[PDB]
Design a protein around this ligand. Structure first.
Ligand SMILES: [Zn+2]
Lengths: 198, 136, 191, 51, 105, 169
């Protein structure tokens, strides 16, 4: 409950229509967003369902000109950006607004792999899906209905992580080291004090 | 090795004498024991020392601390209160970093604006020595 | 009835040593090593005697408690496999045409290419899995012996063979042409 | 054939029950069918022997 | 210092409404941090601006206000109904809104 | 809920004054439902009706020892769509009232049986373990029962969070 500028969400983990029924209340509230990592969403549903379900949209189309007819993106990204531009009044100016506040990628696309993402707990699939309940992973599902890029988002990833790893040793280092002084400075008066203030 | 190895999984047992921090309700952030136990969800607490009266409670409504102590199952209050003292569970709890972090955030909220401004001045002073120590 | 707590007990032998963190299982023995990721299941393992492991499930339903005991057996199987191995004596049953079968190695992969099967001009190729060794039985003619550490590899490999010699369209009772499995067992003898 | 092997391959083919509803080849001591398209039915028979 | 704000940041949410028909007299206002009505009751009475800028310099300032106050809490979520002096625009849904601290206590 | 006692007379007729009196441990949410449920249970045992009759006394019975975990045997006549059944459920609860509350849920969950279908025929604290027939009670009557609560979950008051959650306990 804080009105940041942007907010990044590591899609990873999150269920869907949950982490998605919020991302949506957080647009019609001016908030912003930017769910990264989609390719990792988790939708209740044993893979095989969730993909008959799909083959139950993929097959709805404007009879007479299958073009106008609902556009079935596959894009892991998009698969969870409908589920939204689906939970919003998106035909009322104040709707576009919304969906214009909500970028959405899979794997993490710069302007972001350098900002802290944050995970909408009320969604995770580790705080809901009663353990055992089979669940899936867009990142697949998708893969199984046209997305031409996972294998190329399993690349660009690692390549990432690696860095964001080799950038979390430079962090530690810097710290434990900063924690060896907090001590040398510990006990001091300055503290016996702030040691109360708090 | 040759010594097998299993991780193993360490937990907090809801057992008899697992002291518990009551999350919500009239008690609210008090210790008590889980005396008798009813079933998976339901348990029966008492922390007469703390002042949280004997009651069945949902184990969602409570939280298990790492502390345990000696109780016999179905121990009334007056029993519990005695064995509580002999173990010295409230003093074990007080020392725990959990309890220290609880009493901190309360003490933070208690601070006056003036007393909070002190903390700008003192925190500032701490930086300077730290940042100076960082170069060295 | 949601069963509060259940437990099977794996009795590990003297020789072998099982390494289990999270739900992965490196059983290591005389004959080799065999990993397995039970992470689909949600049991909890617990060392006791070095030759014992309480596997357990807390607050499991009829379904979950079931998955406790299979977990036991799956690892019991790894344990059996990394000591005693597995040996799956298949046979070639045929009436007329003999099933000439040969371990024919393409690209270092090893295939059990099946030939002259029921007079099929087709060459029916099985691929042999990683860590399953294929042996033609001396003395006993027209039998193929798959053997390995992981039973789930071997038996499955031995099946692939068995199902690659199905007889389509014909009435199967009459055409018992086919490779079959005589004797699943273990490699180390006197046991 | 040599009856050992006929007995072997008849174990794997003929010595088998059948679901009456889904016709599915079942195991012999099976009570119910495994297939869920006939409602895991108990209605089985033996697979008929040659001759 | 860097920080000067003596108000509390509020996002203007909606009008009070039914399924269908809405009532622009009364605006729902979110408040930063406020989870529950127990929390929110502090903000009752506390004035609320909606500041907003413009093209024209109407009165020595190309910049404007709509004052108002919070009257009551709203649901269990620390939304706060707020009658403004004039009703808020509806262009202002999702808009920043200055809940102040005066009429203090 | 509470467990009202309800006592009722019938009325006095000329010729037969001082009638027999009856008593029922009605598990009713309040004085008013007590007085129904009493008469609803009377009207199935005698030839008396709230009109031709009277309540004598409501008294709310309280649990004697309400912080002791008890194994409550309860017999239930519940009416299905098809036909009406008897039962015998057993309920580890700290009061009769809680048990009989938590039976009505258990009936409702497991038999869609609404409060209005169910009769509570008898309720009994079982003294001995062994008399506890049901396995699902028996679980918790084990010498030294310890267990964990694996997969703990935290109710974050906020929308977001940064720490990335955990189920350790
Ligand atoms: Zn069938």
């Amino acid at each position: 409950s804080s009105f940041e500028p942007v907010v990044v969400i590591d899609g990873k983990g999150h269920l869907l229509g949950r982490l998605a029924s919020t991302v949506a209340k957080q647009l019609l509230n001016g908030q912003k967003i930017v769910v990264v990592r989609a390719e990792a969403l988790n939708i209740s549903g044993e893979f095989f369902r969730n993909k008959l379900k799909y083959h139950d949209y993929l097959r709805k189309a404007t009879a007479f000109n299958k073009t106008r007819g609902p556009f079935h993106f596959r894009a892991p990204s998009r698969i969870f950006y409908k589920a939204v531009r689906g939970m919003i009044s998106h035909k009322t100016a104040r709707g576009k607004a919304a969906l214009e506040r909500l970028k959405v990628f899979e794997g993490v696309p710069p302007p972001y792999d350098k900002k802290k993402r944050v995970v909408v707990p009320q969604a995770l699939r580790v705080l809901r899906l009663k353990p055992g309940r089979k669940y899936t992973t867009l990142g697949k599902l998708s893969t199984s209905v046209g997305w031409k890029y996972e294998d190329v988002v399993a690349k660009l990833e690692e390549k990432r992580k690696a860095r964001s790893a080799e950038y979390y040793l430079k962090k530690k280092a810097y710290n434990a080291v900063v924690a060896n002084k907090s001590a040398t400075v510990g006990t001091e008066v300055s503290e016996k004090l702030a040691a109360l203030g708090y | 090795s040759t010594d097998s190895v299993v991780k193993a999984s360490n937990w907090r047992l809801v057992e008899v004498g697992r002291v518990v921090l009551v999350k919500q309700g009239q008690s609210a952030g008090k210790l008590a024991t889980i005396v008798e136990i009813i079933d998976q969800k339901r348990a029966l607490i008492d922390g007469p020392t703390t002042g949280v009266p004997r009651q069945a409670i949902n184990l969602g409504q409570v939280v298990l601390t790492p502390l345990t102590f000696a109780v016999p199952r179905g121990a009334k209050s007056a029993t519990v209160s005695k064995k509580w003292a002999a173990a010295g569970v409230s003093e074990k709890w007080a020392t725990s970093s959990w309890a220290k972090k609880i009493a901190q955030r309360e003490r933070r909220a208690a601070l006056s604006d003036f007393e909070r401004f002190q903390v700008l001045v003192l925190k500032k002073q701490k930086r300077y020595a730290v940042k100076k120590a960082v170069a060295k | 009835m949601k069963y509060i707590q259940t437990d099977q007990v794996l009795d590990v032998p003297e020789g072998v040593t099982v390494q289990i963190r999270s739900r992965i299982i490196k059983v290591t023995g005389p004959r080799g090593v065999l990993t397995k990721n039970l992470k689909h299941i949600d049991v909890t393992f617990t060392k006791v005697s070095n030759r014992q492991i309480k596997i357990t499930v807390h607050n499991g339903d009829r379904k979950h408690v079931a998955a406790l005991r299979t977990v036991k057996s799956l690892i019991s199987n790894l344990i059996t496999g990394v000591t005693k191995g597995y040996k799956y004596k298949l046979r070639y049953v045929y009436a007329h045409f003999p099933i000439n079968v040969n371990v024919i190695e393409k690209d270092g992969a090893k295939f059990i290419e099946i030939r002259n099967f029921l007079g099929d001009k087709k060459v029916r190729e099985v691929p042999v899995r990683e860590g399953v060794s294929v042996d033609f039985s001396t003395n006993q003619k027209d039998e193929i012996v798959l053997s390995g550490n992981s039973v789930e590899n071997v038996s499955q490999n031995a099946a692939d063979i068995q199902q690659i010699c199905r007889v389509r369209n014909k009435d199967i009772r009459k055409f018992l042409d086919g490779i079959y499995v005589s004797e699943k067992g273990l490699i180390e003898e006197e046991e | 054939i040599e009856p050992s092997l006929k007995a072997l391959a008849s174990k794997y083919n003929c010595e088998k029950s059948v679901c009456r509803k889904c016709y599915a080849r079942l195991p012999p001591r099976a009570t119910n069918c495994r297939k869920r398209k006939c409602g895991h039915t108990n209605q089985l028979r033996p697979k008929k022997k040659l001759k | 210092a860097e920080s000067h704000r003596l108000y509390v940041k509020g996002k203007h949410l909606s009008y009070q409404r039914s399924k269908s028909v809405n009532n622009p007299n009364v605006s729902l206002v979110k408040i930063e941090g406020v989870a529950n009505p127990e929390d929110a009751k502090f903000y009752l009475g506390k004035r609320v601006a909606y500041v907003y800028r413009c093209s024209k310099e109407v009165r020595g300032s190309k910049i404007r206000v709509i004052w108002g106050k919070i009257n009551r809490t709203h649901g269990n979520s620390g939304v706060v109904r707020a009658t403004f002096r004039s009703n808020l625009p509806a262009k202002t849904f999702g808009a920043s809104v200055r809940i102040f601290l005066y009429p203090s206590n | 809920f509470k467990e009202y006692q309800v006592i009722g007379r019938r009325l006095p007729t000329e010729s037969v004054p001082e009638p027999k009196l009856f008593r029922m441990r009605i598990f009713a949410p309040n004085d008013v439902v007590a007085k129904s449920r009493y008469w609803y249970f009377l009207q199935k045992l005698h030839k008396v009706k709230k009109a031709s009759g009277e309540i004598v006394s409501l008294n709310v019975i309280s649990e004697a020892h309400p912080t002791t975990v008890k194994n409550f045997g309860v017999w239930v006549r519940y009416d299905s769509r098809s036909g009406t059944h008897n039962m015998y459920k057993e309920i580890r609860d700290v009061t009769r009232v809680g048990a009989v509350e938590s039976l009505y849920q258990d009936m409702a969950a497991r038999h869609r049986a609404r409060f209005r279908s169910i009769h509570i025929l008898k309720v009994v604290e079982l003294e001995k373990t062994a008399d506890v027939k049901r396995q699902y009670v028996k679980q918790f009557l084990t010498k030294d029962l310890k267990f964990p609560l694996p997969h703990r979950v935290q109710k974050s008051t906020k929308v977001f969070a940064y720490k990335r959650p955990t189920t350790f306990y």
